[PDB]
Every structure is written in C-alpha cells, then in structure tokens.
Design a protein around this ligand. Structure first.
Ligand code: ZMP
Ligand code: SF4
Ligand code: SF4
Ligand code: SF4
Lengths: 112, 156, 208, 44, 114, 176, 318, 26
C-alpha cells in the first residue's frame, strides 16, 4: 500500500523520536506558560505514558498518523491554543479510580 | 429594634441599586443572541429599565448565556464568568443553554450552562421571545429585590 | 408522468450533461472510472483517487470546462466498503452555467492529494474532512482541527462514532477548571426503528 | 366559496423602491460668500 | 495658597472615593477572577512585551512642534510693542518655518505610518 | 438585468468643484446626517410599556405546552405516542397502561421544556388536539428542575389556559 | 468661606456629571426611536443614583498582573484634574483668577492624559496597552492644533486671562470672527476628551473597553465621572471662548444662566454627534489632525496675527 | 493656462491646502 510519510518502521520510529524530543523539551515551557500546579517530571512522565500507550503499533502508516496527530497536539500547546483545562485533561483527576479486579467489579455493578 | 430597621432599610437601598442598574455583558452565542438584540431594540428597549449592555466582563453584573454552549466554548464561558466581579448573576436564555435543546444528544454540546456556571433565571424558548427574555430579566430584578444580604449579616 | 404533483423533467440538460460526461471521460480516461447523469440533471464523474489534482485542474482551466468555483467538498462514510470514505467535489462553472461532481475514495490510512493548489477554497474543506472523518490530505499547507474541541479525540462524522460521543464537560469546584468525564446521560437517546418492512420503490430493487 | 388571503382586485398600489436622497442646501459660492461676509462683519 | 487648597481638596476627595470603593463592598477574590482579560481565553504572551510604534517619526516631530507652540505662546504680549514691523516679520518667519518643516515631513513621507 | 452601484464619475465644472470643496470644508453631509438624527429625535419612540403593554401576537403563536380535555372533562390524550415520535428533540416521554375503565390513558407524559425546540410538530401530529402549544411565553423559572414538566404540570396548564387555547384553536383550525 | 466655595464648585459638578449620564442615555434613546431610563424614578431621574450605588457597592478587583500603585493613582489623577480644570472658569466670576488661566487649562489637560496612559500601562493587559498607545497617538494629533487654535482665538483677547473673554465679546460673539477656528477647536475638543468619532482610547466595539477594561466598581466610576466632567468643562470652555454672554455686574445670575444654557447646548451637540457618526480609525484621526487642520491652523494663526496689526485693532494688554 | 489647470486640480483634490496657502499668503 502507498505510504504516508515512511516506507519502513525504522523510518517511522525516527519521526516518533523527533516528536518525543519536541514534546520533552516543551514540557518545561508548558508548565511555566500555563501556570500548571504539577512538576516538570509529571508532565514528562505523562508524555512518556501517552507515547507508551501506542507502543504495540506495527503498521508504519498508523505510526505516521499518530505522529501527525502528535504534532497537531504539540502545536496547540506551543501556540497556547489549548488551555489549562485542555492540558490537565490528560491527568484525570475528577475521575474516580475504577478497579480492574474481578471481585471489585463484581461488588460495584454489572460492568463486564 | 432600631438596628434591624436601619439594616433592612440599607438592604433595600443596596438591593434597589443593584436590581435597577443591571449591566449584562455583550455575550451571545447563537440564535438566542438575535432575539437578545431585539430586547435592546426600540420596541422593548432594555436600556429603559436601566439594563445597559457593557462589553468587558469586569464592568458587568449579569451574564446572559444566549445560545448553545459547546464543549470548545465551555472553558471560555467559565473564565469570562469568573472575571465578573461579585455580585454577578447568570441568566440562561433558550433551551440550548438550559439543557442542550435541539442538540442535547450531541458529542460537542454541554447539556445546559448549569453544568458550567450557577444559573439564577432560566428563560425557556427556542428562541424565547424578546418579552420572554425581558420577563426573565424583570424576574431577576424581583429576585434581587428579595435579597436580604445585610439583614442576614445583622442576624449572623 | 404529468400534472402538477409530478416534477417536470428537462431532457435537454440531461443530454447536454451526458455529452459533457462522455467528453470528460474521453479526455481523461486514465482516472475517470464511471460517469452518471441523475434524472434531475446532475452530472457525476467518478475518479480514481490519484486523479484528484489532474481532473480538478482540467475542470478548472479547460476552455470547455470553466469550473472555477469550488461549490463544496465533503466526505461520505459508508463503512460497508473497503474505502469507506467517499470524497465528493462540487464544482460550479459560471461560464457555462452548470455544475459537476467528482467522487473519489480513500481508506482510513491512504492519504489524498490536497486540491489547495487547484482551488484555494479547498483548504478549510479538507481541514473539516480531516477533523470529521479522519481522512488525511497530503501536501496540505495547514492541516489541523477546525470544528472539534482542541483536545478532542476521535472523528465524529464517522458512521461508527457514537452520536453522544465518549466524553462530556462540566465545571469542578475542586480543580477550579472545566474537566472532561465519560459521558453519562440522564435520559438515553431513544433509538427508533422506523423502516417499513415493505419495499417502497421497485425501481431501486437490488438483485437477490 | 374559497376565501383565501388574496390581493385586492386590480392589485396593490405602487411601492417605491428607489433611492430618493434629496438635494438640499445652497451652492458652494453662496455658502462661502455667507461665511466670508460673517467674517468681515466680525472683523469690523 | 488658594490653588494649593483646591488641589488638596480635589486630591483628598478622589482618594476618599478610592478608599470607599475599596473598603465598602464585600470582597471575595480568587486567582481566576484577577487573571488578565483576553476575551475569555488565556493570553499567549505578556502585555509588557515591545509594542512597535508605526508613528514614531510623528511623535519625534510632535516634540519640535510643541517646542514651536511654546515659542508662539508669547505672541499676545508681543503685539503690544512699538516695533510692530519687526515683531510681525519675526512671527510670520516662525510660522513660515513651522509650515516649511511640516511640508518637508509631509513630502518626504514622514507623516505616513509603518 | 443588472445594476452598477458606484461607477459614477464626478463632473469637473468649476461650479461643481466649488460645491464639492464647500462640502469638504463646511462638512455639509455631516450636518445632513446630524439633521437626520435630529429629526429622529422628535419622532415618537416605538417603545411599549412592558409589562403593562404587551407586543402583538397571533392565534398560531407556539408557547408553553398544555394537555387539553374533552368538553366532558376527560383527557383527549389517547396515548398514540406519535407526538413523541415526531418530536425532533426527543423531549416527550410517554408511558401508557390500560386504565381502570380500559381506555388508552397515559401514565407518564413528560416533556422537558429545556430540550423542546418549540416547533409545534407535537400539536400538528396529535390526532385529537390533546397536546397544544398554548399562548403562554412568560413562564421563566429560577431552577432547571421546574422546566421538566410532568403530566400533572401539562394537565394543570391546559385547565388554566383552556379558555384561550380553545379560542385560538377555533380561530385557526380552518387553516390546519 | 473659600472652602465653601470649593465645595459649591465640586459637588454640583459631580451631580451634573451624574445627571449628564442619564441625559446622554435618554437623548441617544430618543434619537434611536427608544426611551432612555424611564423606570428608575420619575422619567429616570433616579438612574444615576442607582448606577453610583451599584458601582460603589460592587466588588473592585485588583488584577494579578497589575502594578497596584499606578493602577490606583491613575483614577485619582483623572478625577482630581477633571475637578481642578473648573477652578479658573469665569462664570461670571472665576473661583481662582489667574492671569494665565488658559495655559493652566492646557497644562491640566496634558497631565490628565497620563491617567489614561498609566491606567492602560498598569492594567497590564493587551487591550489596555493598545488603549494607552491610542491615547498617546490621540494626544500627539490634537495638542498642537489645540494650542495653535487657542492662541489664534486669544490674539483678539489681549491676554490669556479667561475673565477678559467676557469683555472681548461684549458686543459680538467671537465665533463671528473665527468660525473656522471654532469648527476646528470643536473637533479638537471632541478628539481630546476621547469622545464621538474619536472614542479610540475606549473603543467599545474594537477594544472591548479600552484602557479601562480591567477597571471595575469604584475606579471605573471615577474614570467615567472624570470623562464626563472633562466633557462639560471643555464645552464650558468652548462657550466662554466663542459664545460670549452678556454680564450685568449687578445681576451675575443673567450670565450664569446664559453660560449654563450654552454649555448644555454644546454637551447635547456632543451626544448628538455621538449618535450620528461612525468611529474614526486613529490612523485617520492623526492624518486628519496633521494634514487638514494643522496647515489650516497655521494659516489662520498667521491671519489672526496679521489682522489686528493691519486693521489697527490690537486688543489692550490689561 | 497651466496655472488655471493646476489651481482647478488643486481645489478639486486637496481643497484644504488651497485655502491655507491663500489665507497664509494674504
Ligand atoms: C502534558 C502532557 C502531554 C501528553 C501528550 C503526549 C502526546 O502527544 S502522545 C502522541 C505520540 N504518539 C506516538 O508517537 C505513537 C508512536 N507509535 C508507535 O507505533 C511507536 O510506539 C513505535 C513506532 C512502536 C515505537 O515505540 P516503542 O519504542 O516500541 O515503544
Ligand atoms: S434555544 Fe433554539 S434559538 Fe436558542 S440558540 Fe438554541 S437552537 Fe438557537
Ligand atoms: S398527546 Fe396526542 S399525539 Fe401525544 S400521545 Fe396523546 S393523543 Fe397521541
Ligand atoms: S414543540 Fe417540537 S420539540 Fe417541543 S415537544 Fe413539540 S414536537 Fe417536540
């Protein structure tokens, strides 16, 4: 199939690393500009966590699309198009912890 | 007692000033904003009651949410409300701002501005007529008239 | 038929549109796959997805096709096809007072050449197609969210995207900000099964 | 009998639809002369 | 000393109005309310960043024009002299030079912005 | 079939040039606009003295909903549920059971005025003229919950505005 | 007794400003087919009191990014100078009789500008900074023309003493002698007070609220009062300068009334202009004031210097 | 000839400057 930006996973992994460097070097500015009440480590760990969620992906086309969406998210953060509400949406705080144990799920509700 | 009478009379003076010089901010989101303009139109003339449309939120007393409150707009509406100096009031105009209206089951519509800001008066309609919005504002003036803020302080 | 209830049919425009469709198909056989003229005199040309720029540039610059105005640019999600997304171009020819349609197809991954170089209006239309459906347009000057929320995830106009979405907003007093939470409805959207069990139009009966 | 809302027999009257911004004031010569005369009287 | 009294009274009245404004109402302040206003959204940059003047030349020349206005102020008393010929020639000379400076700035595209 | 706005060259006659210079220097058109708004000053204002004076309305006005009853006193609503089916905002919620008499009577008829689009499709679909958008438009509430009307709220509304609702139906039913 | 005179010149001016707010609202309404404030009090006469009580019972907010000292000093300077520019006005007798009251008025106006500047700068907001820069540009455009026109019209007065203006116009209004200067001075006063077609410092439709966008409750009320007091004072200056009034030394009330009526007419014309024209662009404002007025002001300054000498009509020094 | 054309053009495009130079000249 026709590629999007890369023809090999190695080429696709290169763009992921480039995005990570841009994201990693942006977190100190994001905390400073948005006046976040978190630490630089928390944001950088959060960036790592979101990258690690899409770690099982093997199709280079999907990898390119994820980086394309990754750059779009970074542009909003750099340009302060996002707000403190948008930035802190990754750090789910109002959401109560949902246990993943069967017995805990059994006690709560009919959730399969 | 003489103390209660002075406080009650002072409370009436404070309430009368606030309710008779309500300054809504120029904040309109959708179809309901057009009918809001018709309340400021010569036929109904909101300025006749002292209701004057100031622009900056810091120089306003009432926020009339007139239109659909989308998810993209919700943080902007809250911050603009928070920048209003107290005492501030919110009047929800139209079914879109009341409980989502026509777009209640929409992925990008907040189901009523009540989930973002506390609302004092709910004006029903799609859009509510210029009298219906005027009725709600005049109802807000009556609600302010029933505010015993100092009278409670004397009994705190 | 005739009489006031029916809509009159104009054969002259039908013949003209069919002739022009044959003309376009002859000029551009490399990309044109199918040509149709609907009974209400609307011409559709079906183009291989690689033919976006060539066919549109021809329909814009050709002396016998001055479709210099991009009326619309939308996508149709049919999840029953390999290429679910169907990109539709609506053109207007002020010189000949007629309109034409160009339809291509694309997957959830295969990109489409951006027609910004052909029509400058295609910019925001392609941005909206990307935002709503997920179709990526290569060589696009600025592709980003145009209609959805800034931190929105998912493409809503897809047929498999839920009507009410997955997340909802509200103001929390603890965090002093608007927070996104999983969608919970006080009343569920009552889905209605309205299709009648009897065939309505015998002229569109598909083979068994 | 049918009693729809219909135009009166013979139709309605003529409706003006063109601009009628009138011509007002004096010519430039007259206005300048009046101004200069007032200036001269004030000077004297 | 009467002018000093008037100035003192006006300043005291204004400051008393400020005091009543800042101490009569019920105050409830929090971080979001006191944040800068940027039409509902958060500002991108600081308001103390450079703000380019497209009419800088106009201001620098307004300096000299204010100077010339200062030079022209004594004219009502200057008409009371016996040397009306010299006084009139010098006043017209100053006005002609002011007009010439304005014309030079105008023709050399100085009054234009950017 | 088309008209040229602007596209009007000015005459360069010395009289015309002098008139234009007089307009530029003496601000003739500015005084013209000033006179226009001064004339508007001495007009009678179009304001109405609300709430003592109310704006004009028509029998077709779509306002607060109400469930009407037959002259006998019984509800017209026979729970056909097509008013709920036609409602484009899905504001109507209807549940019905065979009443003790065995008739088709709703047990729940709930309309959230906070979701309704005041389209009228409900009153136009009802085959027995039961649900009818009445003439009331000033029913603003201080809380959201008051706008979620029950069957009792609608029935009560119908009984209050019946006289007027009937009169409006009688005035307009020939057009429907 | 002098303190009583100070109070009798300040408090009535504040009441006049308060009721001028209502007068403006009602005039705009009736020129817009509307009715001004008509519910609060009979014919709306109690609206200003309600507005003042609301503003002074409203919570004032101190911006987090704002420099507190300047943010508080600006409103005080604005009101104090607005109340001070009435001290030398001859109605018919001035509270403080200065030989150079006119230059005092010019200096007091020049200082008042810093109120808008500091209020804008200290507000620490982009819109407020834009408003302050627009105020700077506005004062760049009108100040020279204002001073030149004032000098030219005072060349027939003999001195900068304001009281002498009454004598100079004892037989004829000075507008019959300098009506082009009268027009240009009127436009310059419109531009100076940040008023009709020149409301660029505030810019309601373009800058939300301009320099005072971050001001609320009391300070905002003080800026509004200062603005309207400057409006009335500048209209009074226009009245005394061109529309002279008869003064019978034994019945000063005659002048006072005539003066008041002329000032009221000029303020009503200010509102009239406010509800009749669109707003300038401050680039166009500066271009107008520098390229249509200033050349003409210089020419008329030459003319009004040469005229008394060429006609042997030099006014007396004393 | 040329003077008349210049003055007519001057008072048609920039009438403000024409008056100022005339008043200043006088
Ligand atoms: C303030 C918090 C901001 C958090 C936002 C962080 C983001 O924008 S996450 C978007 C980035 N997503 C990606 O790069 C997807 C990468 N796709 C992949 O397939 C990769 O995981 C690869 C190519 C398998 C390489 O990853 P591994 O080294 O195997 O693991
Ligand atoms: S309530 Fe109706 S008219 Fe008002 S904004 Fe919503 S959809 Fe538009
Ligand atoms: S109100 Fe009318 S349409 Fe609705 S369920 Fe009752 S009878 Fe049927
Ligand atoms: S007026 Fe329209 S939206 Fe409201 S209940 Fe009737 S059909 Fe539904």
């Amino acid at each position: 199939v026709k590629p999007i930006f890369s023809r090999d996973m190695n080429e696709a992994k290169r763009r992921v690393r480039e995005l990570y460097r841009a994201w990693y070097r942006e977190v100190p500015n994001t905390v400073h500009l948005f006046q976040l009440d978190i630490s630089v480590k928390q944001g950088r760990d959060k960036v790592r966590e979101m990258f690690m969620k899409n770690a099982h992906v093997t199709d280079p086309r999907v990898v390119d699309l994820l980086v394309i969406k990754g750059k779009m998210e970074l542009e909003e953060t750099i340009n302060v198009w996002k707000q403190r509400t948008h930035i802190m949406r990754f750090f789910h705080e109002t959401e109560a912890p949902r246990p993943t144990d069967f017995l805990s799920k059994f006690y709560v509700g009919h959730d399969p | 007692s003489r103390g209660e009478y002075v406080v009650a009379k002072l409370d009436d003076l404070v309430n009368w000033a606030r309710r008779s010089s309500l300054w809504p901010m120029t904040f309109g989101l959708a179809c309901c904003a057009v009918e809001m303009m018709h309340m400021a139109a010569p036929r109904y003339d909101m300025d006749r009651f002292g209701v004057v449309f100031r622009a900056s939120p810091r120089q306003s007393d009432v926020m009339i949410v007139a239109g659909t409150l989308t998810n993209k707009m919700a943080p902007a509406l809250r911050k603009v409300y928070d920048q209003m100096p107290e005492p501030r009031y919110v009047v929800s105009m139209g079914s879109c701002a009341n409980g989502g209206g026509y777009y209640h089951y929409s992925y990008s519509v907040v189901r009523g501005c009540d989930r973002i800001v506390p609302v004092d008066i709910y004006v029903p309609g799609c859009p509510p007529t210029a009298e219906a919005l005027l009725y709600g504002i005049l109802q807000l003036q009556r609600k302010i008239k029933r505010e015993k803020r100092l009278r409670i302080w004397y009994r705190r | 038929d005739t009489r006031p209830t029916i809509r009159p049919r104009n054969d002259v425009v039908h013949k003209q549109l069919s002739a022009f469709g044959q003309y376009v198909a002859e000029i551009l056989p490399k990309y044109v796959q199918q040509v149709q003229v609907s009974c209400f005199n609307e011409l559709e040309i079906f183009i291989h997805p690689d033919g976006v720029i060539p066919v549109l540039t021809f329909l814009r610059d050709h002396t016998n096709a001055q479709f210099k105005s991009l009326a619309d640019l939308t996508a149709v999600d049919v999840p029953t096809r390999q290429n679910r997304f169907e990109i539709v171009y609506n053109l207007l020819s002020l010189r000949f007072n007629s309109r034409i349609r160009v339809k291509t197809y694309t997957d959830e991954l295969t990109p489409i050449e951006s027609s910004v170089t052909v029509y400058k209006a295609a910019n925001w239309y392609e941005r909206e197609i990307w935002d709503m459906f997920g179709v990526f347009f290569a060589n696009h000057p600025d592709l980003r969210r145009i209609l959805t929320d800034y931190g929105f995830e998912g493409h809503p106009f897809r047929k498999d995207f839920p009507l009410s979405g997955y997340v909802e907003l509200r103001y929390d007093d603890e965090v002093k900000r608007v927070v996104a939470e999983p969608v919970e409805l006080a009343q569920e959207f009552r889905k209605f099964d309205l299709n009648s069990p009897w065939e309505a139009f015998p002229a569109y009966r598909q083979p068994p | 009998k049918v009693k729809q809302d219909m135009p009166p027999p013979g139709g309605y009257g003529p409706i003006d639809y063109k601009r009628n911004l009138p011509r007002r004031g004096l010519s430039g010569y007259s206005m300048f002369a009046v101004g200069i005369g007032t200036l001269l009287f004030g000077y004297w | 000393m009467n002018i000093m009294l008037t100035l003192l009274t006006n300043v005291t009245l204004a400051s008393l109005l400020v005091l009543i404004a800042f101490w009569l109402p019920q105050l409830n302040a929090y971080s979001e309310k006191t944040s800068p206003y940027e039409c509902g959204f958060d500002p991108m940059g600081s308001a103390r960043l450079p703000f380019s003047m497209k009419f800088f030349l106009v201001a620098i020349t307004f300096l000299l024009f204010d100077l010339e206005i200062a030079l022209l102020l004594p004219l009502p008393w200057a008409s009371q002299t016996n040397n009306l010929k010299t006084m009139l020639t010098m006043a017209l000379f100053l006005l002609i030079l002011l007009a010439a400076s304005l014309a030079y700035e105008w023709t050399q595209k100085g009054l234009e912005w950017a | 079939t088309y008209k040229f706005v602007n596209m009007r060259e000015p005459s360069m006659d010395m009289k015309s040039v002098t008139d234009r210079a007089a307009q530029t220097l003496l601000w003739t058109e500015l005084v013209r606009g000033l006179g226009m708004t001064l004339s508007y000053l001495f007009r009678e204002p179009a304001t109405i003295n609300y709430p003592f004076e109310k704006g004009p309305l028509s029998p077709r006005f779509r306002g607060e909903h109400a469930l009407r009853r037959y002259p006998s006193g019984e509800e017209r609503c026979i729970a056909c549920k097509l008013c709920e089916a036609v409602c484009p905002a899905q504001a109507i919620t209807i549940e019905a059971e065979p009443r003790a008499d065995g008739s088709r009577r709703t047990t729940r008829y709930d309309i959230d005025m906070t979701k309704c689009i005041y389209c009228g499709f409900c009153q136009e679909a009802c085959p027995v003229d039961a649900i009818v958008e009445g003439p009331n438009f000033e029913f603003s509430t201080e809380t959201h919950e008051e706008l979620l009307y029950n069957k009792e709220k609608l029935l009560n509304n119908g009984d209050k505005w019946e006289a007027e609702i009937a009169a409006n139906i009688q005035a307009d039913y020939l057009y429907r | 007794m002098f303190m009583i005179n100070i109070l009798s010149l300040i408090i009535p001016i504040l009441l006049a400003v308060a009721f001028l707010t209502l007068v403006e609202r009602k005039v705009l309404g009736y020129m817009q087919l509307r009715k001004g404030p008509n519910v609060v009090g009979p014919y709306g006469l109690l609206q200003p009191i309600a507005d003042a009580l609301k503003l002074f019972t409203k919570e004032p907010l101190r911006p987090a990014t704002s420099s507190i000292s300047m943010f508080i000093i600006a409103p005080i300077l604005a009101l104090s100078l607005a109340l001070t520019m009435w001290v030398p006005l001859p109605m018919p007798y001035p509270l403080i009789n200065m030989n150079l009251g006119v230059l005092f008025m010019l200096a007091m106006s020049s200082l008042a500008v810093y109120s808008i500047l500091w209020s804008g700068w200290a507000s620490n907001s982009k819109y407020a900074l834009i408003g302050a820069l627009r105020a700077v540009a506005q004062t760049i455009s009108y100040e020279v023309t204002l001073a030149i026109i004032l000098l030219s019209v005072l060349l027939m007065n003999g001195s900068y003493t304001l009281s002498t203006l009454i004598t100079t116009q004892e037989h004829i209004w000075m507008i019959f002698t300098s009506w082009p200067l009268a027009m240009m001075w009127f436009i310059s006063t419109l531009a100076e007070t940040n008023r009709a077609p020149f409301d660029l410092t505030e810019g309601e439709s373009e800058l939300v609220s301009g320099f005072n966008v971050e001001y609320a409750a009391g300070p905002f009320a003080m800026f509004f009062m200062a603005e309207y007091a400057n409006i009335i004072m500048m209209n009074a200056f226009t009245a005394i300068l061109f529309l002279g009034a008869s003064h019978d030394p034994h019945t000063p009330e005659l002048y006072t009334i005539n003066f008041v009526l002329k000032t009221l007419a000029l303020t009503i014309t200010f509102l009239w202009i406010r509800a009749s024209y669109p707003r300038f662009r401050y680039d166009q404002l500066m271009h107008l004031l520098w390229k249509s007025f200033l050349p003409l002001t210089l020419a008329l300054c030459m003319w009004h210097i040469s005229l008394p000498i060429m006609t042997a009509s030099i006014p007396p020094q004393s | 000839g040329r003077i008349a054309s210049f003055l007519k053009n001057a008072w048609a495009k920039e009438p403000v400057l024409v008056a100022s130079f005339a008043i200043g000249g006088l």
